[PDB]
Design a binder for this molecule. Structure first.
Ligand SMILES: OC[C@@H]1[C@@H](O)[C@H](O)[C@H](O)c2nccn21
Ligand SMILES: [Ca+2]
Length: 736
């Protein structure tokens, strides 16, 4: 029963600065692996470390990068060569072609045309095995590149061993940051040299310098194979040596099988059938991408118990730790997918978040590996509360709540996206003003209002004092403070209470983040009825929604000074101002359900699924973003979506396959049966749940978990009478 066959690690690699089709690299890794491995086509330092259109590989690199924008840390590479012992990253490079390359989650192989070498690699969570097949040559070499900005290398010939550390990073690390690595060869060195800032030094054992490296050599027969066992650690060499045991004594074939098994274990929790090969590939590739971030950032001590280097305070402490995710992205549906299908994994992650707070003073928003300045909002609140409300409960609930309250009245002194920038204005006025030097003020307000509803939900659940509950119940309505009755849109508001003038609904950034008013107005996840009312009723609301799709993709880009890829991605799509390639508008289509018109959602969701996702190297319509854009497709292909994390609800869309089966960790299974599904039959004519007629526009977490069968009768005509009743509507705070 194999699903890995459908996973294309190359999907999203054909991307540029100007137009993203994913901005991914081939992550050769275990699910949520501490260390990822990738072929490297880019130069050292370039966020675009692998691009499909590149012709040369120059190394096989350990990487932790979550995006080309955030860039990398804990990074070093290995490169087999023939002829001269050359360290230079250009001179050592080799031409290759994609037809000479095999990429899967558990195994990567490539043929290096300028050296006549085959490279294979199979990783575990923290370690990896390389196998190099060399040609007949007197002078065959392996290059180890510890990268620049301060590193260390040491050759240990009595053990066919090279060790070292790397420090090049992109911010967000303590002063003592190091990644310690160990490499063991099965073949003795006949040549050895370390490299000091590009200068080759034969029989010198050790370097401590800006850019350290090593070159070892030997004679090879035709087809002779040399294996290299590699592990790394954020704690020490001794711990890197312990991590190495993950490999046991396995060879390439045995480790590949183990990795294939670990991926089939997780991918196979969702079985789809009755689709075409494009759909299978697109689905499972998206699922693979949803099971990578945040990465494990903990290691195992001698008793098999988790310990971690703190990317927050630089100490080595007990317990879980994860990193490399921006909650601004992944609150939306990535983490919800974990709460539905992988709750035991999120349990580890949530414990890790308690540790971020204890070690740093704040919950993270963007972490890579420590706090990084990027995006907006206080959406850790959604993550933390959603997990708790769906039965993923940390040990220390006391600290959990305190951490949440802390975030509402503090901003990190060095990292402005950590905590709530503008909390003082927000707490006092009910919004962050447009004219007080706090950029992206309207986006901050709207997301905080939602984050406060999340806190309200937990405070109520925890039976906090009525005063606290009331405060957050009030703050949750702060989205009303930026609604402009005249345009029916959200609008920047001045400190004096006047609306910002002149108002451009089509202007990106400024008051908003990477979007305009037409994208951000819909950010009222917890109260769509409230928004419906603000607009003057469901008919007007639907009119506003339809117009998003109907207009040209005209924009105003003056806040950025250039057509950023996010805007360009939107212009080429021919779907009006529906900017699906970015996060803010991603839940929007599901809002049709709340207005009593689910057939419109069914239509537009099928459009997006068919057109905006392809399984090739240019498969996405914009940045993939650590699982968010991928997990969107996974949920939407299943036929539902967590519009409002922190509720128990999944809002109905339209399924893509004829059959889908979910295998929950509790041992129950759900069958979603849509036997008449096709390219033409994308409307839901009727639905039943275990025999009972089901006309509601939503499904509940605990009902899903019980198991059984959902039957969906597909049709090529919209049913105008189903899901229009009040009791069919999903949750709105205003009705509560
Ligand atoms: O990757 C960092 C952030 C993302 O978290 C976010 O999705 C945003 O769209 C974006 N554009 C460029 C970089 N970023
Ligand atoms: Ca994005």
């Amino acid at each position: 029963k194999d699903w890995t066959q459908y996973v294309n690690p190359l999907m999203g690699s054909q991307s540029t600065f100007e137009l993203s089709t994913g901005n991914t690299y081939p992550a050769i890794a275990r699910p949520w692996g501490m260390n990822f491995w990738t072929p490297q086509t880019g130069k050292m330092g370039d966020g675009w470390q692998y691009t499909y259109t590149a012709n040369k590989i120059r190394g096989f690199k350990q990487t932790h990068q979550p995006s080309p924008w955030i860039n990398d840390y804990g990074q070093f590479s290995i490169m087999p060569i023939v002829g001269q012992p050359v360290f230079d990253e250009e001179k050592r490079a080799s031409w290759f072609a994609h037809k000479g390359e095999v990429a899967t989650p558990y195994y990567y192989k490539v043929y290096l045309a300028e050296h006549d070498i085959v490279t294979e690699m199979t990783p575990t969570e923290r370690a990896v095995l390389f196998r190099f097949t060399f040609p007949e040559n007197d002078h065959s070499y392996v290059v180890v590149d510890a990268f620049d900005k301060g590193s260390y290398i040491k050759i240990i010939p009595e053990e066919n061993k090279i060790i070292g550390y790397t420090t090049r990073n992109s911010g967000g690390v303590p002063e003592n940051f190091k990644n310690y690595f160990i490499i063991e060869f099965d073949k003795p060195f006949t040549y050895k040299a370390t490299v000091e800032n590009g200068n080759l030094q034969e029989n010198v054992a050790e370097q401590t310098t800006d850019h350290a490296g090593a070159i070892i050599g030997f004679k090879t027969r035709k087809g002779e194979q040399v294996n290299a066992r590699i592990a790394s650690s954020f704690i020490s060499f001794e711990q890197a040596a312990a991590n190495m045991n993950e490999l046991g004594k396995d060879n390439i074939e045995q480790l590949a099988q183990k990795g294939k098994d670990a991926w089939n274990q997780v991918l196979g929790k969702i079985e789809v059938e009755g689709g075409n090969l494009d759909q299978y590939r697109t689905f499972y590739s998206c699922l693979y991408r949803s099971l990578l971030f945040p990465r494990k950032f903990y290691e195992l001590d001698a008793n098999g118990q988790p310990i971690h280097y703190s990317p927050y305070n630089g100490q080595v402490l007990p317990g879980y730790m994860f990193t490399d995710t921006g909650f601004w992205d992944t609150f939306r549906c990535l983490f919800p997918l974990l709460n539905l299908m992988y709750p035991s994994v999120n349990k580890e992650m949530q414990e890790g978040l308690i540790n971020t707070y204890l070690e740093s003073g704040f919950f993270p928003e963007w972490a890579s590996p420590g706090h990084r300045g990027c995006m907006v909002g206080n959406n850790s609140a959604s993550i933390l509360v959603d997990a708790y409300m769906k039965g993923v409960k940390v040990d220390d609930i006391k600290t959990l709540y305190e951490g949440l309250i802390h975030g509402t009245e503090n901003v990190h002194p060095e990292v402005s996206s950590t905590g709530r920038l503008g909390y003082e204005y927000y707490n006092k006025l009910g919004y962050v003003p447009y004219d007080v030097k706090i950029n992206e003020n309207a986006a901050r307000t709207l997301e905080y209002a939602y984050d406060d509803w999340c806190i309200y939900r937990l405070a109520k659940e925890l039976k906090r004092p009525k005063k606290e509950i009331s405060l957050f119940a009030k703050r949750a309505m702060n989205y009303k403070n930026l609604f402009d009755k005249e345009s029916k849109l959200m609008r920047g508001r001045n400190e004096d209470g006047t609306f910002q003038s002149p108002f451009s609904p089509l202007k990106w950034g400024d008051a908003f983040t990477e979007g305009n008013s037409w994208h951000y107005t819909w950010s009222v996840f917890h109260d769509p009825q409230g928004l419906i009312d603000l607009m003057g009723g469901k008919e007007m609301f639907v009119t506003m929604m339809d117009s998003v799709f109907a207009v040209p993709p005209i924009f105003d880009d003056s806040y950025y000074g250039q057509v950023i890829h996010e805007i360009r991605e939107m212009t080429v799509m021919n779907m009006g101002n529906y900017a699906h390639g970015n996060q803010p508008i991603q839940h929007m289509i599901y809002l049709y359900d709340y207005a009593g018109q689910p057939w419109k959602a069914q239509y537009w969701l099928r459009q997006v699924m068919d057109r905006m996702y392809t399984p090739g190297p240019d498969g996405y319509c914009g940045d993939e973003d650590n699982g968010q854009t991928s997990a969107w497709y996974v949920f939407s292909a299943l036929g539902f979506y967590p519009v409002c994390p922190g509720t128990d609800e999944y809002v109905m869309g339209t399924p893509l396959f004829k059959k889908a089966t979910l295998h929950f960790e509790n041992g129950n299974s759900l069958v979603i049966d849509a036997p008449n599904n096709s390219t033409e039959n994308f409307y839901i004519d009727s639905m039943s749940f275990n025999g009972a007629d089901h006309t509601k526009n939503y499904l509940r977490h605990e009902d899903l978990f019980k198991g059984g069968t959902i039957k969906v009768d597909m049709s090529n005509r919209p049913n105008l009478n189903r899901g229009t009743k009040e009791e069919d509507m999903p949750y709105s705070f205003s009705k509560e």
